Design a protein around this ligand. Sequence first.
Ligand SMILES: Nc1nc(Cl)c2cnn(Cc3cc4c(cc3Br)OCO4)c2n1
Length: 438
Amino acid sequence: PLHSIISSTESVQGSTSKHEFQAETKKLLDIVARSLYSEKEVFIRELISNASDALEKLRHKLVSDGQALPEMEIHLQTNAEKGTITIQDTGIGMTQEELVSNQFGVGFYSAFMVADRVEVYSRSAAPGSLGYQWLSDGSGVFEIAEASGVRTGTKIIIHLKSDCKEFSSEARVRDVVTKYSNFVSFPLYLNGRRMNTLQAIWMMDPKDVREWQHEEFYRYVAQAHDKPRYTLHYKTDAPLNIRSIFYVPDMKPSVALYSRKVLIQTKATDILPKWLRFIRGVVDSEDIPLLQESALIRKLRDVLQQRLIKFFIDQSKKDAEKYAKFFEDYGLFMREGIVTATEQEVKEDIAKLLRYESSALPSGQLTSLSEYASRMRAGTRNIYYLCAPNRHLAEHSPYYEAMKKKDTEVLFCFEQFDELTLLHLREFDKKKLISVET
Ligand SMILES: Nc1nc(Cl)c2cnn(Cc3cc4c(cc3Br)OCO4)c2n1
């Protein structure tokens, strides 16, 4: 089962031509190498991500041209003996000009975060392409030379710093891979061992994913053994770029942040409003660059809050008995969110999820503030509710019994935390929330 492709096949016949980065390239290299990423280990993530993109570009090209498909793989090799770590892909490679002038991303230069020297071999996939070697110690000077024995694609050999030797031990590198790159779109091997088995199902067409995949992934992200009660597969480009799946556990009572199938933060606590912290799943967006995550993250937070509210509302429409169970189990969060919200309009959005018993309905079945209001006739600026220990006492309440042959229907709350929520909300839509007993 041991499968490796990394070996010394490369040789350079002539001497190298020395180049020197410009004022820009000098700033870039310095900032990315020590000022940009907080943890140094993410260089593995960036290079893996680069290798994936190059693999994709070649595959799309061959498939577009109708050509057959070669081995499309990503390989990592650690050498603690030589203090090196190497990553090779068999993707679309690089031309001489690209090796010289170079938006695949900076991500490649993140290597100088842990290396005092980087040695590169690349060969373009286009027929008759030549291979080239690229050398650099990161001092703004790099060398270029035509190389033979270069396989199509790109091979990066990192000569690790004295105190970065940890990334030459397989055990350390394996952990880094499984942490950040477990959903990589192409086969990934480490010292010949296959490492990635999980599929990024959030990138799929939602109507192609089936139940068992959503169950598997839910159990992964939520580290859970039950099943998702609710599943929302949300994809969008207009507001921002968004690839995401949200789950509500079957069980009674966080979301991962990804970008292009690579992990940014396992606990994206700021991605959703605090009251939606019961939601499990993943958010993938190309729009994200630590303790301070908030920036335009908020814009995404607001997008997701609105999409989730509409989701649960739509759920209410199609299924009321299931949603009534959901409201029973998770109402707490909605109430917390309503009392927490600063803007009134946000309060009323979340409040659209609340369900209460009504006087004009059989005891047991619930209604929403909107549903109550629609039937309201010749009624201005009022929503009437009564809080009692139970439906029995609510109906037999003289306060309500007054509304018996009178104008309006009356909502029934049986818990004090529901009444306080209405009091706090004050007005909803065109109407003010008012207690029968004053
Ligand atoms: N794996 C892979 N495949 C391809 Cl097609 C490309 C294209 N750019 N890069 C990153 C990169 C690598 C370099 C470099 C500048 C950059 Br930007 O100078 C030395 O090597 C790639 N990496």
